[PDB]
Design a protein around this ligand. Sequence first.
Ligand code: EYK
Ligand code: EYK
Ligand code: EYK
Lengths: 172, 172, 172, 317, 318, 318
Amino acid sequence: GLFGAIAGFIENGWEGMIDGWYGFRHQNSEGTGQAADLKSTQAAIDQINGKLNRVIEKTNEKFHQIEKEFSEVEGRIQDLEKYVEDTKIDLWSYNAELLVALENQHTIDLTDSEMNKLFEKTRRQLRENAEEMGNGCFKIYHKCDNACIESIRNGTYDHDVYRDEALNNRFQ
Amino acid sequence: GLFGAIAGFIENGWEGMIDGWYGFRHQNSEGTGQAADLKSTQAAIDQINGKLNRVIEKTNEKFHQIEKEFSEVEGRIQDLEKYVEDTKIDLWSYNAELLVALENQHTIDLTDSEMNKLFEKTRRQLRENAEEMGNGCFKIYHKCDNACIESIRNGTYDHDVYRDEALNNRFQ
Amino acid sequence: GLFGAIAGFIENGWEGMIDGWYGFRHQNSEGTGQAADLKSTQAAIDQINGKLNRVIEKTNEKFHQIEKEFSEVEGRIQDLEKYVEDTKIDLWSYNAELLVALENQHTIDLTDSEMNKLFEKTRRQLRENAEEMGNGCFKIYHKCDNACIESIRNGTYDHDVYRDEALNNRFQ
Amino acid sequence: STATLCLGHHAVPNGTLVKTITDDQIEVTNATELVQSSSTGKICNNPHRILDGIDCTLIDALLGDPHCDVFQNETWDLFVERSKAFSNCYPYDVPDYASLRSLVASSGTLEFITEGFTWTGVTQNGGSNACKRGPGSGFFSRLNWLTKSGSTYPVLNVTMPNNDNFDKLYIWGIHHPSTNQEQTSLYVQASGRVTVSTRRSQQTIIPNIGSRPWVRGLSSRISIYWTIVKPGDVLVINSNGNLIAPRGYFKMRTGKSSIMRSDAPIDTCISECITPNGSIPNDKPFQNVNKITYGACPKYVKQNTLKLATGMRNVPE
Amino acid sequence: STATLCLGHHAVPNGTLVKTITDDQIEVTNATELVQSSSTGKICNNPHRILDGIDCTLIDALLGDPHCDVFQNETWDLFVERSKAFSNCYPYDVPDYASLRSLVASSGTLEFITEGFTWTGVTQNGGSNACKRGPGSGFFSRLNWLTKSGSTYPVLNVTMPNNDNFDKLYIWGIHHPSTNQEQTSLYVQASGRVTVSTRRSQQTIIPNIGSRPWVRGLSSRISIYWTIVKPGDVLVINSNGNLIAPRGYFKMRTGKSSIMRSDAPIDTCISECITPNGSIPNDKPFQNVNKITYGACPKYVKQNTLKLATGMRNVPEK
Amino acid sequence: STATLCLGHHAVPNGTLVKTITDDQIEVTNATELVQSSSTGKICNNPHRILDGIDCTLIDALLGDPHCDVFQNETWDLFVERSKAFSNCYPYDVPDYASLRSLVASSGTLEFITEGFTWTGVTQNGGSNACKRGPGSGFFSRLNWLTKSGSTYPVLNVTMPNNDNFDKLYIWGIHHPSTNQEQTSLYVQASGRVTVSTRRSQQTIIPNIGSRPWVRGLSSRISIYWTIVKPGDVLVINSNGNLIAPRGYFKMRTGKSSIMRSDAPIDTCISECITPNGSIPNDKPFQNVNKITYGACPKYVKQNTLKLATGMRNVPEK
Ligand SMILES: CC(C)(C)c1cc(O)ccc1O
Ligand SMILES: CC(C)(C)c1cc(O)ccc1O
Ligand SMILES: CC(C)(C)c1cc(O)ccc1O
């Protein structure tokens, strides 16, 4: 994907995470846990439903058309009727093939994009208190309990609180 | 948008900015101010005009074609004449519908992209003298008067002039 | 392109890199050097081949069709026969024109993307030992001989080995 | 002491293969199908008015072949012709059969109004053993077989104005006898003629004596023609032998009506889209069932599957 | 001492909704319309040569119905047929009328050259009450109603070789009397015959006797037929009754000519694209005005509006 | 001490200009062409069965014009008609010629099978100096010209059932004499008739007497018709004069067969795709050579070039 996160710097997916599309796995003083991120899971699903509804949107109704099967050989005019329908089918088939190709390429890019959006959002929250290990994981340079992990997970984390502690472990 | 800048990590637009598409707001010891970025504004406008010219270009001319309205019931040949036109119309309609979907999606992504590009260009200039607050704002860690700000806006900011002062406020 | 790298924060390309699509130039105590990155070069090429194999695949075959040239004027049927063909051609030509436009826009974006992936991969390896000068170049803040350079190139660089040396030069 | 916070995304044991711009096959966590491949095999009788032709082609229903009498004045959104339909009355051919079938199919009604045609000097209501109603000979319900009366066949010449505000459709025909012995004993003159004209158009058909393959006892034939009379115009039928005359006219409607060749059973269920293989759901944009369709249908396509990715790329552990 | 630098983008109070791959409706700062849906209501007389048929159909002008004489030798890029048009000469049909209309429309000229047909032993210039030219009896200016001369109608049989380097269009016909009596008073023979042929092609019609509804007093009819003779080929006409002879040929050109049905007034302006509803501008790629068009026109489409975003997503302060 | 690591991408001196969504022309490192626009000029004789008609048209081969006798029972994947073809037997027209040409072309075989028609009371094998086989008079090899036998021509009324499990194609005809004399000398009846029927169809054609342009000595003509008999159906020919009877039937096949007009030389090579301009390769998705094609061909398109980018944007330092 264009962003390098899914099937990129994030080595692989988690079959263990059944409650969302994107999320956090941590390890601290209290042990190890795992939680889905709702906002980003929702962003991906919303856009995919958007795409989907737009393609499942009304067909067109047709009533009396031309005949398309023939029981006798006739010549000029039947050739024409066959060529018109054959041309139409080929054009629609081309349409359908291209459509899923564009859509799918795009679906993979946007999901890759959302994963990266979440990574960047976390990075920014953590400010000067964490470094990126380059595999999806941040190393947080301060003591950080389950309450603290959750403050990151729900975007209330106060970098100032932990700055001195973190700078010390980071640069000493 | 794929980059997460517009309608993303940058909460909203500025209706005040009537002199460009992208820009800067600052608050320094010498006051506040706002100014548009021309290069990025222009980058985005040039691409949109590009799209536009490419689609506004080249209607083709048809002269004698087939009849399309009929004043009596004829049967087989007229059914074909109608089916042919009906088919042509459904296909062009699908073309136009898809054309604007793709274009529009791409215009939103590219404008988003330009926003992000301006951010990243600015971040790069600042080097170690600033930190990224996480909402499109830099906390610049040193005295930056109006000329200092203007040197950022116009690409001439010399991070070395302030590196000492800044690192000092930033760590320690 | 959407990512700001090719014809972006990287001023320009290297006419002198004749053995890959991407890479490195460097300068350490041992002199200067140049080397292709094979993994990224290979990513771009593989995708471009995928695109190409998908367009150049699958000629459909047609046998008996309608006549498409006429020795004498006949009116209604011939009008239709010509309108049908003229319609088919215009639609196929629109398809063809649009296919290259999308494809090419995409090709330019993914190669721009790949350039940016390689930059990010590298930044990540260097952790706190390097700073970005904003033109595609890192300043590595420690003595980094040819084995050190090769280690960054092939993704085995150990930031821990040089961290103290680097932090010291970077801040004190 | 430090903490570790990893970011990730989900994966699944079994993912779906999907096409992109750059790959023929690439695994995603989830996809839906965009091509409808299957039918229940049954045509739903709602919400369209589906008229089962059973034993009859629409043309036989129009003409009024005795076994098709049920269809008098009938009406349809979609008339379904079954492959087993058979003709069982005087043998006939319709020049430009496909057009007549089309224009009637599209009108969507067999509503017939009988008119007071006066045929003075001829015997009306001719019948044949090729076409029985009940015990003895019979004929098309909607046609009137005119033969000599008292040894002469006058030159018939009759009028019918269209004083209504709709178009009338007249079906008529001409008789091709197989021998002059038949020709003369039926029509006196050795050479018949039929002229049927309006203010806007005219047709003259000449009988051709000669023998065709034996069908239901006959080597004769009846040929079928139509005339549409607009409001204000008038019909003139002029003939001195061989006329198969109209008994009146069919109303012509415009609307969503058509015709379809299918042997699929009709059942009680609701489906917008009809195909010769039976109704099909129309949730998906494309379909691979049949290029022949009626109603609100997906667009017929050559592929039998197109998967639309509905999740991210799948990367299993 | 420190500072704050914020990056951002613009917004407007008045967004425009637009469609994307993922959204039915999403607000952008600005957009432009891609479907032309409005018309002045008027066909511009430039740059296309517009011929208003006023009260004549092209066929009636071709045949030379008296009230359509103004049109002799006319030329057009677009022949505009008005719904007010009416026929006022002998009553007639044309089998395959649409085709004749098409081929003349496309040719774009009515240029007619008279030729010296010599009809030996018959009376020329028949005329009818159903087709008055001024005081009395008349007929189509381009057709010659032949009739018996002195109780005999011989087997007509004549040639006209095409010795030019263009195609000749011959218009001719056959007369369908109402009664056997009329048949014989006009042509003597109980049943007439017309055979028009070239080296490669041939048409042969017999007439149809029978009563029909009155049109301008007549129960009788004439059917119109046409023949194209290529350079180096020859016309052969052979009849022993009921021939409505040609008086010559129409020149045949190929070009951008066509025909259109419209009641739109003609006006003075420049507009490349014509439509029955009137001329329309062609700056936009698509149009919703009419599927029938002439010239450089946008492609007809079912949507009445398609917005192309021309600015970023609009995310307003408010 | 410090080090410098720079990241970059290649450039080339010879860029290619390409088209995108946002740019009319933009330079990439490399591109490939997607429109095939050239031909060798020659039709490869593999892998399709090519059959060069030389001086014959398919219809003339079908009917059996003497100089086209070579083609009896032939078979083709693609019959190639040359412009130098000429007709050299009795003068004829086929009402609905295009259709007969098309249906035989699609059948792909001239396989003819003689049947035992018995024509009680008429002379067979009529011939003419317009159609010489060898030195003396002749006729279409697959048609049988019937005339009077001993001053009478009785109402012919022959039958012939289809009992095979395949469709039969009958080619028959009718003769249009130039003069009333010629009619009676040949067929006795002053006015003739042909009626050909099955349970499904029937056709009656009535000859029309008169002069047509001189071709190979003749002012008269033959008109060609056709009937397809289904398994289980029966052919009934019935005529009191002027019949040009069939000798048997052609076998009808279905397959990938067709016909093409081209003056391009056949040649020993392999190409899947034929065009009247010659064979063309089919590696590229589109072509600009000819809208007329046969085989596995690129889609015809109006552009003569469409470049697909296969490298990044090109940005040399210079
Ligand atoms: C990849 C593409 C979408 C161009 C495509 C491939 C194909 O084999 C048939 C139709 C297509 O649109
Ligand atoms: C969004 C899409 C472009 C797939 C579409 C929707 C529609 O209602 C008709 C045609 C389309 O291509
Ligand atoms: C730019 C676009 C790809 C929409 C285009 C322009 C054109 O002149 C013909 C077809 C096209 O698809």
